[PDB]
Amino acid sequence: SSLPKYTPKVNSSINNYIRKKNMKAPRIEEDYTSYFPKYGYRNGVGRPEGIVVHDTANDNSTIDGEIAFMKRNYTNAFVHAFVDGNRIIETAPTDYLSWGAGPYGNQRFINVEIVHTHDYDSFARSMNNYADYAATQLQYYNLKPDSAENDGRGTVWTHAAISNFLGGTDHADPHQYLRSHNYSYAELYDLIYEKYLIKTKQVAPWG
Ligand SMILES: [Zn+2]
Ligand SMILES: [Zn+2]
Ligand SMILES: [Zn+2]
Ligand SMILES: [Zn+2]
Ligand SMILES: [Zn+2]
Ligand SMILES: [Zn+2]
Ligand SMILES: [Zn+2]
């Protein structure tokens, strides 16, 4: 195409594998629940400020199990979306907040969960799927990707970054989870950034 290829800012054999395989994220599915609460973000309904990277609390759950448990326990916690190696499922409308990152995170950011995977390919697909969903939301909300990890400013936040800069929570996901699969947030962010650039037609698509 007329567009330049993205130059990766982070060395990543897993990202290389994703790009070379030309992985295609699945369609975003809606699975909403009538009794979930619908409250605006701190700047209003329809005004999220960014997106949070979570991994699921359990290492052995399925996306279906996670969702069923959440519907039963929504007064304790619920999130906007789950991704695994096969599916992207939005469980609450992104124009309203969700209950996944403590009081301060919840007022600002879309909460997205990475379901755990147990093989190389499934893990790589789940990373592609998270990154694709995140880039889609940033594009839809006219937000630009900016990692908050080191200075507490921007639109892409790990739960760890929320804990560090905002408080109201102490979870450090997804760092240890990604490390256990020989990956990292730095690599995930580089993938989000590239996918955002592809979607906004600034760099060439894969193929
Ligand atoms: Zn709908
Ligand atoms: Zn979390
Ligand atoms: Zn495991
Ligand atoms: Zn949506
Ligand atoms: Zn495993
Ligand atoms: Zn920045
Ligand atoms: Zn957690």
Residue numbers in the entry: 7 to 213
Quote what the paper states about this structure:
During cell division, these autolysins are responsible for splitting the equatorial septum between two dividing daughter cells.
The rear of the β-sheet packs against helices α4 and α7 and is shielded from solvent, while its front forms the bottom of a recessed area that is largely exposed and solvent-accessible. The conserved residues delineate a groove that runs along the recessed area, extending from the zinc ion to both the top and the bottom of the domain. Moreover, the presence of zinc at the center of the groove suggests that AmiE functions as a zinc-dependent amidase. A DALI analysis shows that the closest structural homolog of AmiE is the N-terminal domain of PlyL, a prophage endolysin encoded by the Bacillus anthracis genome (Z-score = 18.4, rmsd = 2.1).
